[PDB]
Amino acid sequence: MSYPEKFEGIAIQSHEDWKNPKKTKYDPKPFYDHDIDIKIEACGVCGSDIHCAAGHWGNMKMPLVVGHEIVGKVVKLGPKSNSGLKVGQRVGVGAQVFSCLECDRCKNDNEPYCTKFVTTYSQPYEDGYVSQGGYANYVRVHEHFVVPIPENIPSHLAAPLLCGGLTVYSPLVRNGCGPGKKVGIVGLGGIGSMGTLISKAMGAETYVISRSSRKREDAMKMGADHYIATLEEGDWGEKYFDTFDLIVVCASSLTDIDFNIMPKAMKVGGRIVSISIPEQHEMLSLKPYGLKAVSISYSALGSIKELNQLLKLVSEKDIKIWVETLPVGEAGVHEAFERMEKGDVRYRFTLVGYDKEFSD
Amino acid sequence: MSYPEKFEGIAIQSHEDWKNPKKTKYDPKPFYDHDIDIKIEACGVCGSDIHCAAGHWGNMKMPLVVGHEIVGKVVKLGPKSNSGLKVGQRVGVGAQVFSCLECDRCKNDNEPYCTKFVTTYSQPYEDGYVSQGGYANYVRVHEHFVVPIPENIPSHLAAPLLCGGLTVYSPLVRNGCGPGKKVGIVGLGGIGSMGTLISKAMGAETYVISRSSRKREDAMKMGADHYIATLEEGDWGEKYFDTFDLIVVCASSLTDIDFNIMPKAMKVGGRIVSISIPEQHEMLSLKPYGLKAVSISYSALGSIKELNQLLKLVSEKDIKIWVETLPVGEAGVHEAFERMEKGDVRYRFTLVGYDKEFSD
Ligand SMILES: NC(=O)c1ccc[n+]([C@@H]2O[C@H](COP(=O)([O-])OP(=O)(O)OC[C@H]3O[C@@H](n4cnc5c(N)ncnc54)[C@H](OP(=O)(O)O)[C@@H]3O)[C@@H](O)[C@H]2O)c1
Ligand SMILES: NC(=O)c1ccc[n+]([C@@H]2O[C@H](COP(=O)([O-])OP(=O)(O)OC[C@H]3O[C@@H](n4cnc5c(N)ncnc54)[C@H](OP(=O)(O)O)[C@@H]3O)[C@@H](O)[C@H]2O)c1
Ligand SMILES: [Zn+2]
Ligand SMILES: [Zn+2]
Ligand SMILES: [Zn+2]
Ligand SMILES: [Zn+2]
């Protein structure tokens, strides 16, 4: 029906026909004291959107609305709301959508690591409702996880930051990325590029680390201080020995990644932080003998604090990421999904034209 | 013959008979401009002394004088010596004995991680001579790697800190071991014991992590603010979820770290540092999302700068490690290698009584 009782969206109907989501109406989650309703206007197509829909993460209950780099207008506020969020405001919602908000980790700005963590879609809340929203007309989210979008960031350029961006930003900040450091980006995909830009915006000397040579010209155009092509090096660890302070791995998979070499290019005390979550059938493998004075670790999304910090940065040092736009709808999400599989993205897809697709 | 012509120690003869080191004389390494000669007066038994003799590091060119926790007085100073070391001065030498002292890692106090790194024993120098010293009347080391043992530290207690000690000290100071911070030591062995102490010494709430409760009492005696039993407490990472900032492991190895549990006990940002040395080819496989907000790596000895700090620390806060001495001689050694390869050590042996064993 309409916005209050039913939500509509382009939802995955089966993990086999994942490339052909169908428009669907579905019950919103129950509305809670702090939840907020957002009418979407733009959403970013994230690699996770794919892994999930393709069933790479396990059998997900269907139907399923994906997409978690949401930008839209506040349309209704929860009873016990409190955060200046005002109906009509252009806000954003990323990958996380809930946290206990009371444990130390939460109060210490580490809600991505909260015990009661809940992702935007494909997860059941305590009430049992499995998070939806994203490629839809409305999303229902607890206010703590809704951020304001700096007035000067085009929606189609703000959206991706909400997850792909925040995902590189959190590890970068936390691990010293900034003036005078030598940062490295593995995998120039959707996150990688944002991670390259954001890298520079923070002040470091960034190295893009890809396997083929295709993305070279593009990397420099983003401000890369240098480019490396694994397949063309034979042992870049050996060659770039003792150069990197921090390296963030943003690959969609870890199969074409040598964690037995990477350490060499790491300065004493350097740190390797992987950001990826590959198919359920993959491990992070390496001969430990190399983690000599080098630390390897995995990182989740970022804190909402960091998320606002990023939004501030992109807004201030005026960051313009690489996005292509497609209209929400079965045909658009199809092309989006299709191309993401083909890796045929000039980095980021942002579904738009939400109002001329969902009507009432 | 004697000191100038050639030394003599309790050398090993074969990786097989490694438990029966026969006394042997050998030509000292060349005496370069900046080297120094030390008539050892005390030495500590390091686990690695065993590991090397047993051949866990591969087949070594025989014979071989192990031991690299050397304590002794200065005999001669190379023609260009400029450390400020006086002859007869009480100094010490540990696991490292050389570094290019010209590379960045060096001018930045990271000698252990230097390219031209050379260990105290069983390794050829730039010139080919295989490093000796240790369980002998003397040892010829580059002055740079000679530290002035503090006047108030009984030489049978100073020695262990040269290696063992320093090995845990570094990981601790480099990872912020101190007031507030909650340190966790895994493996109440030799290195593990000096760790618990130094940890408390440095002002950090310390937990000792062993599987059994055997050493449970000793731990509390050394200052441990708490004790944990691996096998005994089942899922300790759960019980102690989100507590440790740092954990320096000293057990069997890094690939024995049940990451399906240990990480759990690490607070977001936590560091698991192994101090054991992995096989150049051991390969580790943890979930891509296993080290969630937890890093993992290993450390090697420490810089002399740190080595001195440790000494200064031990001197001032006056710490006494749990040492048991033995006669520096074929007989003694056997008792040591024999009780080391068993754990029948009250943490650290110190082969003393040099003067009354080598004569001339
Ligand atoms: N922890 C978190 O909070 C979080 C949040 C969001 C996403 N993620 C993870 O981030 C990934 C999403 O990727 P994305 O959306 O940023 O980018 P994407 O547009 O999917 O591109 C991924 C890029 O990584 C590289 N890649 C793909 N397959 C690879 C393989 N087999 N071996 C080595 N490199 C490969 C490619 O770059 P090159 O060809 O240039 O090497 C590719 O362009 C997923 O794995 C997801 O689980 C984690
Ligand atoms: N990187 C460096 O600079 C450096 C310098 C010196 C030494 N090291 C390394 O440090 C180790 C030397 O040990 P150490 O001399 O300090 O002590 P040690 O007296 O040899 O005792 C080692 C202790 O670790 C634990 N352990 C032994 N086998 C184990 C196993 N299979 N699984 C789990 N835990 C086990 C035991 O403690 P619990 O029974 O209480 O658990 C044992 O008492 C070697 O592995 C060496 O390579 C590295
Ligand atoms: Zn929480
Ligand atoms: Zn994402
Ligand atoms: Zn040692
Ligand atoms: Zn050097």
PDB file of C-alpha atoms in Angstrom, chain A residues 47-275:
ATOM      1  CA  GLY A  47      30.442  -5.415  -3.041  1.00  0.00           C
ATOM      2  CA  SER A  48      28.675  -6.816   0.032  1.00  0.00           C
ATOM      3  CA  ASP A  49      25.395  -6.282  -1.804  1.00  0.00           C
ATOM      4  CA  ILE A  50      26.693  -8.814  -4.328  1.00  0.00           C
ATOM      5  CA  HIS A  51      28.242 -11.421  -2.023  1.00  0.00           C
ATOM      6  CA  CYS A  52      25.004 -11.481  -0.091  1.00  0.00           C
ATOM      7  CA  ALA A  53      22.556 -11.653  -3.007  1.00  0.00           C
ATOM      8  CA  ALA A  54      24.663 -14.260  -4.755  1.00  0.00           C
ATOM      9  CA  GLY A  55      24.382 -16.248  -1.561  1.00  0.00           C
ATOM     10  CA  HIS A  56      28.153 -16.146  -0.988  1.00  0.00           C
ATOM     11  CA  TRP A  57      27.586 -15.595   2.701  1.00  0.00           C
ATOM     12  CA  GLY A  58      25.168 -18.432   3.198  1.00  0.00           C
ATOM     13  CA  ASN A  59      21.508 -19.010   2.614  1.00  0.00           C
ATOM     14  CA  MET A  60      19.644 -15.763   3.258  1.00  0.00           C
ATOM     15  CA  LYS A  61      15.895 -15.663   3.877  1.00  0.00           C
ATOM     16  CA  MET A  62      14.051 -14.378   0.780  1.00  0.00           C
ATOM     17  CA  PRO A  63      12.834 -11.949  -0.403  1.00  0.00           C
ATOM     18  CA  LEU A  64      15.711  -9.638   0.366  1.00  0.00           C
ATOM     19  CA  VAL A  65      16.249  -5.969  -0.198  1.00  0.00           C
ATOM     20  CA  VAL A  66      19.956  -5.151  -0.318  1.00  0.00           C
ATOM     21  CA  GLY A  67      22.025  -1.972  -0.505  1.00  0.00           C
ATOM     22  CA  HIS A  68      23.452  -0.187   2.509  1.00  0.00           C
ATOM     23  CA  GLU A  69      24.938   3.128   1.446  1.00  0.00           C
ATOM     24  CA  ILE A  70      21.666   4.998   1.838  1.00  0.00           C
ATOM     25  CA  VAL A  71      21.047   8.733   1.478  1.00  0.00           C
ATOM     26  CA  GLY A  72      17.583  10.237   1.854  1.00  0.00           C
ATOM     27  CA  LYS A  73      15.232  12.591   3.681  1.00  0.00           C
ATOM     28  CA  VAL A  74      13.947  12.129   7.225  1.00  0.00           C
ATOM     29  CA  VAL A  75      10.257  11.396   6.852  1.00  0.00           C
ATOM     30  CA  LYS A  76       9.151  10.580  10.397  1.00  0.00           C
ATOM     31  CA  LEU A  77      10.774  10.532  13.857  1.00  0.00           C
ATOM     32  CA  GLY A  78      10.528   8.021  16.690  1.00  0.00           C
ATOM     33  CA  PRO A  79       8.745   8.830  20.018  1.00  0.00           C
ATOM     34  CA  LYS A  80      11.843   9.016  22.186  1.00  0.00           C
ATOM     35  CA  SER A  81      13.916  10.579  19.407  1.00  0.00           C
ATOM     36  CA  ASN A  82      16.596  13.149  20.241  1.00  0.00           C
ATOM     37  CA  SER A  83      19.392  14.206  17.937  1.00  0.00           C
ATOM     38  CA  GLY A  84      18.346  17.303  16.063  1.00  0.00           C
ATOM     39  CA  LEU A  85      17.367  15.079  13.198  1.00  0.00           C
ATOM     40  CA  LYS A  86      14.472  16.987  11.697  1.00  0.00           C
ATOM     41  CA  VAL A  87      11.893  15.667   9.266  1.00  0.00           C
ATOM     42  CA  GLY A  88      12.998  16.694   5.791  1.00  0.00           C
ATOM     43  CA  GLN A  89      16.718  16.695   6.602  1.00  0.00           C
ATOM     44  CA  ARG A  90      19.010  14.940   4.153  1.00  0.00           C
ATOM     45  CA  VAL A  91      20.587  12.144   6.165  1.00  0.00           C
ATOM     46  CA  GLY A  92      22.527   8.971   5.471  1.00  0.00           C
ATOM     47  CA  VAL A  93      22.575   5.366   6.739  1.00  0.00           C
ATOM     48  CA  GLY A  94      25.397   2.926   6.143  1.00  0.00           C
ATOM     49  CA  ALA A  95      26.078  -0.721   6.853  1.00  0.00           C
ATOM     50  CA  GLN A  96      25.430  -0.865  10.594  1.00  0.00           C
ATOM     51  CA  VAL A  97      21.881  -0.214  11.747  1.00  0.00           C
ATOM     52  CA  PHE A  98      21.856  -1.125  15.429  1.00  0.00           C
ATOM     53  CA  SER A  99      23.931  -1.535  18.580  1.00  0.00           C
ATOM     54  CA  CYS A 100      23.208  -2.143  22.273  1.00  0.00           C
ATOM     55  CA  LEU A 101      24.469   1.411  22.774  1.00  0.00           C
ATOM     56  CA  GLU A 102      25.363   0.619  26.384  1.00  0.00           C
ATOM     57  CA  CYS A 103      28.382  -1.669  26.511  1.00  0.00           C
ATOM     58  CA  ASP A 104      31.877  -0.202  26.846  1.00  0.00           C
ATOM     59  CA  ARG A 105      32.594  -0.816  23.173  1.00  0.00           C
ATOM     60  CA  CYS A 106      29.549   1.251  22.269  1.00  0.00           C
ATOM     61  CA  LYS A 107      30.264   4.137  24.646  1.00  0.00           C
ATOM     62  CA  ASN A 108      33.843   4.046  23.480  1.00  0.00           C
ATOM     63  CA  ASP A 109      32.868   4.406  19.802  1.00  0.00           C
ATOM     64  CA  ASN A 110      33.284   0.807  18.717  1.00  0.00           C
ATOM     65  CA  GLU A 111      29.702  -0.123  17.972  1.00  0.00           C
ATOM     66  CA  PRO A 112      30.774  -2.023  14.892  1.00  0.00           C
ATOM     67  CA  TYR A 113      32.212  -4.503  17.392  1.00  0.00           C
ATOM     68  CA  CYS A 114      29.218  -4.545  19.726  1.00  0.00           C
ATOM     69  CA  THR A 115      27.868  -7.897  20.830  1.00  0.00           C
ATOM     70  CA  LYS A 116      24.363  -6.938  19.684  1.00  0.00           C
ATOM     71  CA  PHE A 117      25.597  -5.670  16.305  1.00  0.00           C
ATOM     72  CA  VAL A 118      23.081  -5.595  13.451  1.00  0.00           C
ATOM     73  CA  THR A 119      23.689  -5.082   9.768  1.00  0.00           C
ATOM     74  CA  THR A 120      21.405  -2.994   7.546  1.00  0.00           C
ATOM     75  CA  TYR A 121      20.025  -6.015   5.684  1.00  0.00           C
ATOM     76  CA  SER A 122      19.948  -9.807   5.965  1.00  0.00           C
ATOM     77  CA  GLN A 123      20.073 -10.015   9.746  1.00  0.00           C
ATOM     78  CA  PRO A 124      17.280 -10.634  12.195  1.00  0.00           C
ATOM     79  CA  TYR A 125      16.888  -8.219  15.104  1.00  0.00           C
ATOM     80  CA  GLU A 126      16.084  -9.501  18.552  1.00  0.00           C
ATOM     81  CA  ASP A 127      12.414  -9.317  17.545  1.00  0.00           C
ATOM     82  CA  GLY A 128      13.226 -11.620  14.667  1.00  0.00           C
ATOM     83  CA  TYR A 129      12.623  -9.198  11.807  1.00  0.00           C
ATOM     84  CA  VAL A 130      15.325  -9.515   9.160  1.00  0.00           C
ATOM     85  CA  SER A 131      16.742  -6.079   8.277  1.00  0.00           C
ATOM     86  CA  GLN A 132      15.721  -4.874   4.816  1.00  0.00           C
ATOM     87  CA  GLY A 133      15.944  -1.401   3.202  1.00  0.00           C
ATOM     88  CA  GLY A 134      18.460  -0.087   0.671  1.00  0.00           C
ATOM     89  CA  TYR A 135      17.265  -0.635  -2.884  1.00  0.00           C
ATOM     90  CA  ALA A 136      13.840   0.483  -1.704  1.00  0.00           C
ATOM     91  CA  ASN A 137      11.677   3.557  -1.162  1.00  0.00           C
ATOM     92  CA  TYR A 138      12.042   3.668   2.637  1.00  0.00           C
ATOM     93  CA  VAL A 139      14.362   2.403   5.341  1.00  0.00           C
ATOM     94  CA  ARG A 140      13.577   2.233   9.057  1.00  0.00           C
ATOM     95  CA  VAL A 141      16.642   2.867  11.195  1.00  0.00           C
ATOM     96  CA  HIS A 142      17.407   3.657  14.845  1.00  0.00           C
ATOM     97  CA  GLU A 143      18.480   7.343  14.931  1.00  0.00           C
ATOM     98  CA  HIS A 144      21.877   6.600  16.415  1.00  0.00           C
ATOM     99  CA  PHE A 145      22.837   5.210  13.022  1.00  0.00           C
ATOM    100  CA  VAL A 146      21.591   8.006  10.859  1.00  0.00           C
ATOM    101  CA  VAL A 147      24.003  10.770   9.946  1.00  0.00           C
ATOM    102  CA  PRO A 148      23.532  14.249   8.504  1.00  0.00           C
ATOM    103  CA  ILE A 149      24.861  14.733   4.998  1.00  0.00           C
ATOM    104  CA  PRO A 150      27.052  17.848   4.722  1.00  0.00           C
ATOM    105  CA  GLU A 151      25.105  20.339   2.613  1.00  0.00           C
ATOM    106  CA  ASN A 152      27.866  20.451  -0.021  1.00  0.00           C
ATOM    107  CA  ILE A 153      28.171  16.791  -1.039  1.00  0.00           C
ATOM    108  CA  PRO A 154      26.128  15.646  -4.021  1.00  0.00           C
ATOM    109  CA  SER A 155      23.928  12.759  -2.849  1.00  0.00           C
ATOM    110  CA  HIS A 156      25.294  10.376  -5.489  1.00  0.00           C
ATOM    111  CA  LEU A 157      28.791  11.149  -4.171  1.00  0.00           C
ATOM    112  CA  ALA A 158      27.883  11.026  -0.492  1.00  0.00           C
ATOM    113  CA  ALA A 159      26.165   7.645  -0.484  1.00  0.00           C
ATOM    114  CA  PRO A 160      29.154   5.350  -1.138  1.00  0.00           C
ATOM    115  CA  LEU A 161      31.055   6.956   1.729  1.00  0.00           C
ATOM    116  CA  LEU A 162      28.385   5.598   4.042  1.00  0.00           C
ATOM    117  CA  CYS A 163      30.006   2.143   3.932  1.00  0.00           C
ATOM    118  CA  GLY A 164      32.609   1.470   1.300  1.00  0.00           C
ATOM    119  CA  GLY A 165      34.190   4.754   2.322  1.00  0.00           C
ATOM    120  CA  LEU A 166      33.795   4.487   6.073  1.00  0.00           C
ATOM    121  CA  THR A 167      35.234   0.978   5.763  1.00  0.00           C
ATOM    122  CA  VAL A 168      38.679   2.244   4.612  1.00  0.00           C
ATOM    123  CA  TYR A 169      38.450   5.400   6.610  1.00  0.00           C
ATOM    124  CA  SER A 170      38.191   3.683   9.968  1.00  0.00           C
ATOM    125  CA  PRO A 171      41.326   1.557   9.536  1.00  0.00           C
ATOM    126  CA  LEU A 172      43.233   4.449   7.961  1.00  0.00           C
ATOM    127  CA  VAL A 173      42.643   6.872  10.858  1.00  0.00           C
ATOM    128  CA  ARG A 174      43.015   4.307  13.584  1.00  0.00           C
ATOM    129  CA  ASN A 175      46.302   3.173  12.045  1.00  0.00           C
ATOM    130  CA  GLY A 176      48.104   6.472  11.595  1.00  0.00           C
ATOM    131  CA  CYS A 177      47.244   7.347   8.027  1.00  0.00           C
ATOM    132  CA  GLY A 178      48.109  11.039   7.743  1.00  0.00           C
ATOM    133  CA  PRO A 179      50.945  13.468   6.795  1.00  0.00           C
ATOM    134  CA  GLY A 180      54.350  11.905   6.375  1.00  0.00           C
ATOM    135  CA  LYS A 181      53.192   8.279   6.295  1.00  0.00           C
ATOM    136  CA  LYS A 182      53.451   5.834   3.385  1.00  0.00           C
ATOM    137  CA  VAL A 183      50.054   4.138   2.874  1.00  0.00           C
ATOM    138  CA  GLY A 184      49.217   1.286   0.505  1.00  0.00           C
ATOM    139  CA  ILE A 185      45.898   0.262  -1.068  1.00  0.00           C
ATOM    140  CA  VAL A 186      45.433  -3.340  -2.236  1.00  0.00           C
ATOM    141  CA  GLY A 187      42.638  -3.828  -4.770  1.00  0.00           C
ATOM    142  CA  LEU A 188      41.490  -0.723  -6.647  1.00  0.00           C
ATOM    143  CA  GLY A 189      37.843  -1.668  -6.543  1.00  0.00           C
ATOM    144  CA  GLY A 190      34.953   0.327  -5.156  1.00  0.00           C
ATOM    145  CA  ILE A 191      36.442   0.692  -1.690  1.00  0.00           C
ATOM    146  CA  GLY A 192      40.007   0.883  -2.938  1.00  0.00           C
ATOM    147  CA  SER A 193      39.525   4.077  -4.934  1.00  0.00           C
ATOM    148  CA  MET A 194      37.672   5.826  -2.125  1.00  0.00           C
ATOM    149  CA  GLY A 195      40.486   4.519   0.028  1.00  0.00           C
ATOM    150  CA  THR A 196      42.977   6.041  -2.372  1.00  0.00           C
ATOM    151  CA  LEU A 197      41.278   9.427  -2.440  1.00  0.00           C
ATOM    152  CA  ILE A 198      40.548   9.531   1.262  1.00  0.00           C
ATOM    153  CA  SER A 199      44.141   8.404   1.762  1.00  0.00           C
ATOM    154  CA  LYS A 200      45.469  11.486   0.023  1.00  0.00           C
ATOM    155  CA  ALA A 201      42.894  13.809   1.633  1.00  0.00           C
ATOM    156  CA  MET A 202      44.412  12.788   4.948  1.00  0.00           C
ATOM    157  CA  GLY A 203      47.876  13.651   3.714  1.00  0.00           C
ATOM    158  CA  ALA A 204      49.799  10.424   3.252  1.00  0.00           C
ATOM    159  CA  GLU A 205      51.813   9.239   0.258  1.00  0.00           C
ATOM    160  CA  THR A 206      49.576   6.577  -1.264  1.00  0.00           C
ATOM    161  CA  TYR A 207      50.551   3.539  -3.313  1.00  0.00           C
ATOM    162  CA  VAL A 208      47.866   1.670  -5.261  1.00  0.00           C
ATOM    163  CA  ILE A 209      48.587  -2.039  -5.309  1.00  0.00           C
ATOM    164  CA  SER A 210      46.749  -3.950  -8.012  1.00  0.00           C
ATOM    165  CA  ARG A 211      47.539  -7.150  -9.866  1.00  0.00           C
ATOM    166  CA  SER A 212      46.989  -6.273 -13.533  1.00  0.00           C
ATOM    167  CA  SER A 213      48.183  -3.035 -15.155  1.00  0.00           C
ATOM    168  CA  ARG A 214      44.749  -1.951 -16.356  1.00  0.00           C
ATOM    169  CA  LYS A 215      43.922   0.344 -13.481  1.00  0.00           C
ATOM    170  CA  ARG A 216      47.270   2.204 -13.626  1.00  0.00           C
ATOM    171  CA  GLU A 217      46.228   5.296 -15.573  1.00  0.00           C
ATOM    172  CA  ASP A 218      43.166   5.640 -13.350  1.00  0.00           C
ATOM    173  CA  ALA A 219      45.095   5.338 -10.088  1.00  0.00           C
ATOM    174  CA  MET A 220      47.396   8.220 -10.954  1.00  0.00           C
ATOM    175  CA  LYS A 221      44.351  10.269 -11.975  1.00  0.00           C
ATOM    176  CA  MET A 222      43.122   9.786  -8.413  1.00  0.00           C
ATOM    177  CA  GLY A 223      46.330  11.143  -6.955  1.00  0.00           C
ATOM    178  CA  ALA A 224      48.204   7.938  -6.385  1.00  0.00           C
ATOM    179  CA  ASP A 225      51.856   8.753  -5.635  1.00  0.00           C
ATOM    180  CA  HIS A 226      52.739   5.487  -7.266  1.00  0.00           C
ATOM    181  CA  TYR A 227      51.328   2.293  -8.756  1.00  0.00           C
ATOM    182  CA  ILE A 228      52.295  -1.380  -8.560  1.00  0.00           C
ATOM    183  CA  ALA A 229      51.087  -4.378 -10.564  1.00  0.00           C
ATOM    184  CA  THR A 230      51.615  -7.668  -8.736  1.00  0.00           C
ATOM    185  CA  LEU A 231      51.485  -9.849 -11.846  1.00  0.00           C
ATOM    186  CA  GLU A 232      54.315  -7.731 -13.247  1.00  0.00           C
ATOM    187  CA  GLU A 233      56.605  -7.787 -10.200  1.00  0.00           C
ATOM    188  CA  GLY A 234      57.528 -11.378  -9.362  1.00  0.00           C
ATOM    189  CA  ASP A 235      58.018 -10.286  -5.748  1.00  0.00           C
ATOM    190  CA  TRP A 236      57.055  -6.720  -4.999  1.00  0.00           C
ATOM    191  CA  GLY A 237      57.526  -7.370  -1.304  1.00  0.00           C
ATOM    192  CA  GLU A 238      61.169  -7.946  -2.147  1.00  0.00           C
ATOM    193  CA  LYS A 239      61.224  -4.869  -4.377  1.00  0.00           C
ATOM    194  CA  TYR A 240      59.347  -2.372  -2.184  1.00  0.00           C
ATOM    195  CA  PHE A 241      60.954  -3.802   0.932  1.00  0.00           C
ATOM    196  CA  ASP A 242      60.621  -1.663   4.103  1.00  0.00           C
ATOM    197  CA  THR A 243      58.477   1.144   2.650  1.00  0.00           C
ATOM    198  CA  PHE A 244      54.877   0.968   3.949  1.00  0.00           C
ATOM    199  CA  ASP A 245      53.547   2.154   7.282  1.00  0.00           C
ATOM    200  CA  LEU A 246      50.057   0.826   6.663  1.00  0.00           C
ATOM    201  CA  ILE A 247      48.425  -1.307   3.969  1.00  0.00           C
ATOM    202  CA  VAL A 248      44.671  -1.806   3.662  1.00  0.00           C
ATOM    203  CA  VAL A 249      43.441  -4.843   1.741  1.00  0.00           C
ATOM    204  CA  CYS A 250      40.155  -4.119  -0.020  1.00  0.00           C
ATOM    205  CA  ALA A 251      39.938  -7.028  -2.441  1.00  0.00           C
ATOM    206  CA  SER A 252      36.599  -8.861  -3.045  1.00  0.00           C
ATOM    207  CA  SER A 253      38.519 -12.113  -2.603  1.00  0.00           C
ATOM    208  CA  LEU A 254      41.862 -13.101  -1.037  1.00  0.00           C
ATOM    209  CA  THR A 255      42.903 -15.818  -3.486  1.00  0.00           C
ATOM    210  CA  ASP A 256      44.995 -13.439  -5.614  1.00  0.00           C
ATOM    211  CA  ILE A 257      46.799 -11.952  -2.579  1.00  0.00           C
ATOM    212  CA  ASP A 258      50.177 -13.126  -1.289  1.00  0.00           C
ATOM    213  CA  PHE A 259      50.290 -12.656   2.463  1.00  0.00           C
ATOM    214  CA  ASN A 260      53.768 -14.248   2.423  1.00  0.00           C
ATOM    215  CA  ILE A 261      55.295 -11.338   0.565  1.00  0.00           C
ATOM    216  CA  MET A 262      53.338  -8.266   1.587  1.00  0.00           C
ATOM    217  CA  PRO A 263      55.091  -8.081   4.982  1.00  0.00           C
ATOM    218  CA  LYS A 264      58.456  -7.311   3.333  1.00  0.00           C
ATOM    219  CA  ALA A 265      57.230  -3.945   2.018  1.00  0.00           C
ATOM    220  CA  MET A 266      56.191  -3.127   5.581  1.00  0.00           C
ATOM    221  CA  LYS A 267      58.331  -0.868   7.740  1.00  0.00           C
ATOM    222  CA  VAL A 268      59.314  -2.134  11.151  1.00  0.00           C
ATOM    223  CA  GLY A 269      56.122  -1.681  13.110  1.00  0.00           C
ATOM    224  CA  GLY A 270      54.093  -1.466   9.941  1.00  0.00           C
ATOM    225  CA  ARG A 271      50.542  -2.750   9.907  1.00  0.00           C
ATOM    226  CA  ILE A 272      48.448  -4.728   7.466  1.00  0.00           C
ATOM    227  CA  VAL A 273      44.705  -4.344   7.874  1.00  0.00           C
ATOM    228  CA  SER A 274      42.442  -6.350   5.614  1.00  0.00           C
ATOM    229  CA  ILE A 275      38.991  -4.970   5.019  1.00  0.00           C
TER     230      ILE A 275
END
